[PDB]
């Protein structure tokens, strides 16, 4: 049974050399081992103000925000409010272009609509321009044939998934997901009273924070601390412990397997590989060259329910932040790495695999 002081040793020996090689200002780390969350903090949250990183320090999750979007969407399906096979036009009737015919909610959620772009153009600033962007979009591929990771895709999924609730995205997310799991320090909009905890991200010696953007909340705008994130991983790793029924099923639906892309499977927000897996496979798959590339998919119909023998993970970044989350349900172990500088994905995955290897 790994000793507590042995776990502390492993973490330090992997993280300190990482921060020195990658010039990382600060980092909060959480390792889940045998039903227990272990926190480790390093460096500075604010270089100028010389504020240290603490368990209450808030970091920008960037794309890991998509795991929340997927679970919220999952909860909505579990309630009967939406169906994955539903047409997108059912929820947004103004989307009249013929190219939208045949596109389902599943496609928006899993990046298989046919080439929706990585980013929403900054030229888009309101409902009118947002509608125009989608009406004029010309697909490169037919639906359900190619996966192309994109904010413009799952971003719209989240915006539409909450319409039946009648609540605004931020409210739906707080009342159906955050409050039930007691994630009291997870925000889309950081309150005045909590700003003292919001770290600064760094890029090229400059201090930056994420900028407002269309569909930002649904695709990359969540901020949180290592504690709420640790409890987020535990809720997803062991969903039987979740009290609310729709939420519990929502989490199962987000970890289901809808498509196979080589050795990886696409869930709602979450990405999975079968466990056991070699390090090289997870690491090279995380490189922008593969991760952002368009690749062919194989449909998993019926969708396969959650497989415990899986490596479930998600990378996430913003201009000045770099984060990573990974867990293996069968072994009940997980890891959270939040940093205030965006360093290469491969280096993040390698560090996490090494640490989980010692458990």
315 is in an annotated binding site: yes
Q: Quick one: three-class SS letters along 48-77?
A: CCCEECCCCCEEECHHHHHHHHHHHHHHHH
How big is the chain, counted in residues? 359
- Report the catalytic residues: 63, 149
Q: What CA–CA distance (Å, rounded) separates 18 from 194?
A: 29
Q: 243: which residues sit within 8 A by CB, 6+ positions away?
A: 180
Tokens of 155: 């971003």
**344: CB partners within 8 A, 6+ apart:** 22, 287
**Cα dihedral 45/51/55/56 (nearest 10):** -90
Confirm whether residue 69 is marked as ligand binding: no
316: annotated binding-site residue? yes
Binding site residues for substrate, as ranges? Answer: 314-316
């Amino acid at each position: 049974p790994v000793s507590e002081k042995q776990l502390a040793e492993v973490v330090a020996n992997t993280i300190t050399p990482l921060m020195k090689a990658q010039s990382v200002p600060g980092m909060a780390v959480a390792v889940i081992y045998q039903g227990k969350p272990h926190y480790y903090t390093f460096g500075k949250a604010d270089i100028a103000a010389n504020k240290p990183v603490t368990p209450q320090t808030l970091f920008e999750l960037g794309s890991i925000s998509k795991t929340f979007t997927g679970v919220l969407g999952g909860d909505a399906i579990a309630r009967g409010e939406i169906s994955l096979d539903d047409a997108v036009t059912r929820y947004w009737p103004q989307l009249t272009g013929k190219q939208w015919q045949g596109i389902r909610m599943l496609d928006l959620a899993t990046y298989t609509a046919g080439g929706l772009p990585l980013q929403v153009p900054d030229e888009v600033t309101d409902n009118a321009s947002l509608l125009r962007f989608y009406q004029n979009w010309q697909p490169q591929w037919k639906p359900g044939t190619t996966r192309l990771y994109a904010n413009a895709s799952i971003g719209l999924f989240g915006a539409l998934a909450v319409k039946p609730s009648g609540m605004p995205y931020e409210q739906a997310m707080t009342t159906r997901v955050l409050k039930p799991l007691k994630l009291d320090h997870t925000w889309i909009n950081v309150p005045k009273a909590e700003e003292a905890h919001y770290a600064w991200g760094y890029r090229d010696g400059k201090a930056v924070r994420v900028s407002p953007g269309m569909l930002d909340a649904q695709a990359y705008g969540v901020k949180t601390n290592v504690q709420d994130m640790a409890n987020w991983v535990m809720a997803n790793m062991a969903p039987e412990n979740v009290a609310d029924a729709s939420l519990k099923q929502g989490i199962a639906l987000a970890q289901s397997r809808y498509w196979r892309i080589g050795s990886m499977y696409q869930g709602l927000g979450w990405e999975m590989l079968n466990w056991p897996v070699e390090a090289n496979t997870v690491v090279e798959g995380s490189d922008s060259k593969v991760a952002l590339a368009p690749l062919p998919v194989a449909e998993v119909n019926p969708p396969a329910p959650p497989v415990k023998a899986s490596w479930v993970h998600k990378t996430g970044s913003t201009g000045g932040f770099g984060s990573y989350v990974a867990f293996i349900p069968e072994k009940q172990i997980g890891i959270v790495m939040l940093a205030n500088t965006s360093y290469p994905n491969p280096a993040r995955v390698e560090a996490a695999y090494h640490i989980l290897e010692a458990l």
